[PDB]
Design a protein around this nucleic acid. Structure first.
Ligand SMILES: [Mg+2]
Ligand SMILES: [Mg+2]
Ligand SMILES: [Mg+2]
Ligand SMILES: [Mg+2]
Ligand SMILES: [Mg+2]
Ligand SMILES: [Mg+2]
Ligand SMILES: [Mg+2]
Ligand SMILES: [Mg+2]
Ligand SMILES: [Mg+2]
Ligand SMILES: [Mg+2]
Ligand SMILES: [Mg+2]
Ligand SMILES: [Mg+2]
Ligand SMILES: [Mg+2]
Ligand SMILES: [Mg+2]
Ligand SMILES: [Mg+2]
Ligand SMILES: [Mg+2]
Ligand SMILES: [Mg+2]
Ligand SMILES: [Mg+2]
Ligand SMILES: [Mg+2]
Ligand SMILES: [Mg+2]
Ligand SMILES: [Zn+2]
Ligand SMILES: [Zn+2]
Lengths: 96, 81, 87, 206, 129, 97, 117, 217, 25
RNA sequence: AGGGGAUCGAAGAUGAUCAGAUACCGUCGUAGUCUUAACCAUAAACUAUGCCGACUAGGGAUCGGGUGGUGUUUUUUUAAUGACCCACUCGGCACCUUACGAGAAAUCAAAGUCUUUGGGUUCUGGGGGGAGUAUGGUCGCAAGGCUGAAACUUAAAGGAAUUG
């Protein structure tokens, strides 16, 4: 029945078997592997500031059509280049 | 069906069941006292004997074995107990 | 169902089948109620007065509604030699 | 409970053996087995007629009890008992149903055939199953003429027969009418038989 | 291979109830079964029951009286501390007003009501309601 | 979802069966499958028994018959309407026509 | 082809149900009856009707119609159906039973007329 | 004027049956929507949902509305109706009629102390209508109906005051969710608590008692 | 494309890559 | 690798067909197709359904075994014996009907005895892609097998059934 051992002396299996299975859980693995600290452009930090390299006019995805104003920023803390959207009407003229 | 005397099955149905499946399991086999019309030897056998049983001497043959109930050899007598 | 001061609460107390003691649901519309006549001094069926069994839907659907019903009659006398415990 | 009057009396069993209700289905079914008395060689199955009669009387007892005579719907669709369920219906009130049962009878009140009976008596649970099925939508009990291989589901008190024809369906229906008339009503001093012919419930073509 | 025996017992009972029967067969016959059957009869969820002496381990015929909904086993027979009976009854019983969780204490086998009184505990056998 | 509890024909309890060649398009289908038909006929055919029985010597003479068990892929049995797409419930019926 | 519609046949069972003995077998008299006992919005419909009703009549005479009954036929059926013979069962030579069924007779409490097969 | 066509409506229109429980008691199949209309006025009806579904012509499209209705006093009697109409407030009406036809007896009970009239339920009961399964648990006074708004409203009209719930399955299919919460609070009177262990005689049934005053000419 | 012709395509890719790598011991 | 090499026949060659036709159809034909001694370890290797145990329903066939039948049939006379017939009974390949029950449904005697959730137990899955990829290890003559990520990307992908 059930496909899981039910012995009173089976804790080890039930214990390791879930520890074994927490890995298919994305949010868990991200936490355990420290993806946050490694591959993420921020440190894991909630914010980052960098210097604006150039202005970009990325066009939208389907089925939309517009020129979303963004900027290629270069993050101070780790020199990474990632781009960020600049929200609201003509704010792109606020950043240089 | 639905309500019945499990503790007291009938007889004609209890004799229809398998050897092991009656109210308490018991053997369907017996024993025969077998001699041949020449000799006076009361050689007692088993219903499903697996050996070619003989009388104490005379090199005679009481039964031949099979896949079940033994085969009493030809002209021979038998009372069942 | 009692209460605080023993007073009989609970909207209604349901019939129980007479072959399985199982509650007859208000929507158990295969549940049946048989009414058999008591007979006075020879022949004449006494009107108004019945010997009455109740047979639930489940018993009837599984086709036990005759054998079970039969045991019930023979054991309130209404039958002789038809049903037979040991089989 | 029931006086020695109600016992067999070899007058009836005379008829029952002669009407051949005692002959039954070759292959039985599991629910009718107590009714079986014994099996003849060359595949026959002898019903115990005393059982039949015992149940048959029981049927009458119930056909009675129920107040109004007419809402005791007696049903057939089998030829061999259509006149029978008519003749029965003639005597006791009991509104009859011979031929097409017409689905939507007991359920469905808009129909031009909406019976609301308090009891149902059927001749063959197989060929009339749609009546049987429908009864169970609406709490109505079921008396029925089973054989040895009959769908005992959704019946109640069941009288064993032969229902393979002739007099076997006629007699039981006839007999039923006799004891529903005996008990209460008007027949009385049950010792003496009946003016009414037994071949009155039979089938013709001609 | 058989494993609990008090499992297949309670199941047969449970099974036989559901299908409208008022009698069961129970092979084989462990004392744990009977003591359970005793506890289960003390509150009349079953009727008379009779041991059958095969020269072996036994059989039992229990008489059923409806009103049984489920007689269950719990495996593995967990360790229940005294204030954990409160918790099992919470989990596997229908209402606060009835039903039973029979155990195994050093003070014999008994329903949870009883253990509650004598102030004892141990493993859990199962439940009745 | 599954279309037949026979899956394709009838195996159930084997695992493998030798394959036959489709009589028509020369396919290869497991003998357990294969729409099979016998083809017994007379050599002289209908119309010709006349001239044949006439033109012969011998007292009337016993007609020979030709015998041939046939095997068809589903593909070739369907197309040559040896079998036909039956209804959802019709498909069930194993009865010979 | 000339397949009468339902509006016609419907009104044919209608007149036959009611005014059966007033009906006939000839087109022309019925064709007139339909004007008294019933209201019909056009002669051709009336004729069409009256014509099917009579077709039915001509064949109701040679045995009942598969879906039509009325007062005088119901009476006709009661009588002729209540035929009773010189009885059958009766008995003309004891009771002819095999065995076992005899054992059933014996093992019951009954003598009866003997016969073994 | 209501002209009853069934034996039951007659014995109802006559004042010959005063309580609905009489009908339940005998498992009498109710069919005329006025039977409950008379047996139980003061029975509020609630409009749950009216989402349109669509099919086809022998070509294209089909517009029609699906009304979900709950009828219940607030005292042990609740109904659930689901109808589709070519119209809007057409199914709504039709649903109500169909709802009242479904009105079912509720066995409220005590969480524990049988002080001052039942609040929660006899036992934990659960129902299931294809995938969605609702399960109601007896609750302490002051707990209240702990359910998703729809199910709760069905439980208010049900007469329940406190009860715990637990869903399972696609609870977003409202119609399926309710039909199981219904099956749930309707299965209460099916459950053999030891009170009902007590032996009863079984009443005679208003269909045989008033049998004269029942049938037609 | 067909699962197995995809399988083919990638068994080809691997060989190509394996041999491009090889190019440095 | 040796043997073998009739047939069919990957590659290839050709004749047609096509707008093209590396194809389908036709022709020739290499390897292969068989065997021995070594490898390989994979298939929709399917019942797409782990094993042992218990329980819940009705029917008819059939395979193996056994028991019971003053049954049938076989001789030169009707014994053994062979086959066959009927009932039973274990253990099988399945089939039928049912639906208390289960399921999202298709359907299922298990896919049931599960919110009334626990007989013992082994394995696997946790949105779709990226991808069975990269990388490391390992086994393999090789082809490959076994083990097996992440960056990024994405709002569905998907099942069953219904009506068009
Ligand atoms: Mg750039
Ligand atoms: Mg397909
Ligand atoms: Mg195959
Ligand atoms: Mg294979
Ligand atoms: Mg689920
Ligand atoms: Mg592939
Ligand atoms: Mg490949
Ligand atoms: Mg390649
Ligand atoms: Mg080529
Ligand atoms: Mg060239
Ligand atoms: Mg090429
Ligand atoms: Mg694989
Ligand atoms: Mg098993
Ligand atoms: Mg079976
Ligand atoms: Mg034996
Ligand atoms: Mg086999
Ligand atoms: Mg179904
Ligand atoms: Mg989108
Ligand atoms: Mg799909
Ligand atoms: Mg479609
Ligand atoms: Zn000797
Ligand atoms: Zn082919």
């Amino acid at each position: 029945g059930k496909g899981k051992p039910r012995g009173l002396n089976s804790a080890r299996k039930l214990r390791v078997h879930r520890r074994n299975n927490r890995w298919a859980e994305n949010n868990y693995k991200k936490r355990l592997l420290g993806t946050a600290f490694k591959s993420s452009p921020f440190g894991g930090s909630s914010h980052a500031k960098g210097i604006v390299l150039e202005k970009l006019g990325i066009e939208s995805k389907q089925p939309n059509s517009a020129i979303r104003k963004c900027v290629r920023v270069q993050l101070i803390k780790n020199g990474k280049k990632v781009t960020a959207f600049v929200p609201n009407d003509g704010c792109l003229n606020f950043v240089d | 069906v639905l309500v019945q005397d499990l503790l007291h099955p009938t007889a004609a149905s209890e004799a229809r069941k398998h050897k092991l499946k009656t109210l308490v399991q018991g053997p369907r086999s017996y024993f025969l006292d077998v001699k041949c019309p020449g000799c006076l030897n009361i050689t007692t056998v088993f219903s499903h004997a697996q050996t070619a049983v003989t009388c104490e001497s005379c090199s005679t043959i009481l039964c031949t074995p099979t896949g079940g109930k033994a085969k009493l050899s030809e002209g021979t007598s038998f009372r069942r107990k | 169902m009692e209460n605080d001061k023993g007073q009989l609460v609970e909207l209604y107390v349901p019939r129980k089948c007479s072959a399985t003691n199982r509650i007859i649901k208000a929507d158990d519309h295969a549940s049946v109620q048989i009414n058999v006549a008591k007979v006075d001094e020879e022949g004449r069926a006494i009107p108004g007065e019945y010997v009455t069994y109740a047979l639930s839907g489940y018993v009837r659907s599984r086709g036990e509604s005759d054998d079970s019903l039969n045991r019930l009659a023979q054991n309130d006398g209404l039958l002789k030699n038809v049903w037979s415990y040991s089989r | 409970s029931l006086p020695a009057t109600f016992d067999l009396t070899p007058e009836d069993a005379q008829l029952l053996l002669a009407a051949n209700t005692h002959l039954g289905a070759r292959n039985v079914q599991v629910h009718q087995e107590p009714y079986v008395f014994n099996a003849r060689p060359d595949g026959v199955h002898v019903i115990n007629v005393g059982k039949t009669w015992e149940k048959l009387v029981l049927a009458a007892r119930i056909i009675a009890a129920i107040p109004n005579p007419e809402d005791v719907v007696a049903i057939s669709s089998r030829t061999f008992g259509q006149r029978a369920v008519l003749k029965f219906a003639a005597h006791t009130g009991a509104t009859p149903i011979a031929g097409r049962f017409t689905p939507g009878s007991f359920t469905n009140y808009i129909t031009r055939s909406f019976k609301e009976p308090r009891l149902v008596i059927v001749t063959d649970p197989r060929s009339d199953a749609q009546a049987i099925k429908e009864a169970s939508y609406v709490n109505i009990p079921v008396i029925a003429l089973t054989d040895l291989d009959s769908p005992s589901e959704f019946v109640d008190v069941a009288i064993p027969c032969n229902n393979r024809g002739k007099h076997s369906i006629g007699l039981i229906w006839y007999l039923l009418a006799r004891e529903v008339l005996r008990l209460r009503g008007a027949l009385v001093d049950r010792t003496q038989p009946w003016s009414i012919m037994p071949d009155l419930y039979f089938y013709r073509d001609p | 291979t058989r494993s609990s025996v008090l499992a297949d017992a309670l199941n047969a009972i449970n099974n036989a109830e559901k299908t409208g029967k008022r009698q069961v067969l129970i092979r084989p016959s462990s004392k744990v079964i009977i003591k359970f059957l005793q506890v289960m009869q003390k509150h009349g969820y079953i009727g008379e029951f009779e041991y059958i002496d095969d020269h072996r381990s036994g059989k039992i015929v229990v008489q059923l009286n409806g009103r049984l909904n489920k007689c269950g086993v719990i495996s593995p027979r967990f360790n229940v501390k005294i204030g954990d009976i409160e918790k099992w009854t919470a989990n596997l019983l229908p209402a606060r007003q009835f039903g039973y969780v029979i155990l195994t204490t050093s003070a014999g086998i008994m329903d949870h009501e009883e253990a509650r009184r004598k102030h004892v505990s141990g493993k859990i056998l199962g439940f009745v309601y | 979802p599954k279309k037949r509890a026979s899956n394709g024909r009838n195996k159930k309890g084997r695992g493998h069966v030798k394959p036959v060649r489709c009589v028509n398009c020369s396919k290869s289908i497991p003998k357990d499958k294969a729409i099979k038909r016998m083809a017994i006929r007379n050599i002289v055919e209908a119309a010709a028994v006349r001239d044949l029985s006439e033109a012969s010597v011998y007292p009337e003479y016993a007609l020979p018959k030709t015998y041939n068990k046939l095997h068809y892929c589903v593909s070739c049995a369907i197309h040559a309407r040896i079998v036909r797409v039956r209804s959802r419930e019709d498909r069930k019926n194993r009865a010979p026509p | 082809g000339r397949v009468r519609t339902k509006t016609v046949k419907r009104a044919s069972k209608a007149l036959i149900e009611r005014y059966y003995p007033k009906l006939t077998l000839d087109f022309q008299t019925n064709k007139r009856l339909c004007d008294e006992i019933a209201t019909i919005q056009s002669k051709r419909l009336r004729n069409k009707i009256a014509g099917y009703t009579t077709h039915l009549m001509k064949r109701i005479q040679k045995g009942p119609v598969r879906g039509i009954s009325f007062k005088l036929q119901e009476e006709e059926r009661e009588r002729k159906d209540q035929y009773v013979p010189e009885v059958s069962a009766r008995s003309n030579g004891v009771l002819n039973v095999d065995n076992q069924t005899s054992d059933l007779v014996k093992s019951l409490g009954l003598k009866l007329p003997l016969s073994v097969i | 004027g209501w002209v009853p066509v069934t034996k039951l409506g007659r014995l109802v229109k006559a004042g010959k049956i005063t309580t609905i429980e009489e009908i339940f008691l005998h498992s009498l199949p109710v069919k005329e929507f006025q039977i409950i209309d008379t047996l139980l006025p003061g029975l509020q009806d609630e409009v749950m949902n009216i989402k349109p579904v669509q099919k086809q012509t022998r070509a294209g499209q089909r517009t029609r509305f699906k009304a979900v209705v709950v009828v219940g006093d607030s005292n042990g009697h609740v109904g659930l109706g689901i109808k589709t109409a070519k119209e809007v407030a057409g199914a709504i009406r039709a649903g109500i009629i169909i709802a009242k036809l479904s009105v079912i007896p509720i066995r409220r009970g005590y969480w524990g102390t049988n002080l001052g009239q039942p609040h929660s339920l006899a036992t934990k009961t659960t129902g299931k209508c294809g995938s969605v399964t609702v399960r109601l648990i007896p609750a302490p006074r002051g707990s209240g109906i702990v359910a998703s708004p729809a199910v709760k409203k069905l439980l208010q009209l049900a007469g329940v005051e406190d009860v715990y719930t637990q869903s399972n399955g696609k609870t977003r299919t409202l119609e399926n969710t309710l039909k199981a919460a219904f099956v749930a609070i309707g299965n209460t009177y099916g459950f053999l608590t030891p009170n009902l262990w007590a032996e009863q005689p079984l009443p005679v049934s208003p269909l045989d008692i008033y049998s004269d005053e029942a049938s037609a000419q | 494309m067909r699962a197995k012709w995809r399988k083919k395509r990638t068994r080809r890719l691997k060989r190509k890559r394996r041999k491009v790598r090889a190019r440095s011991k």
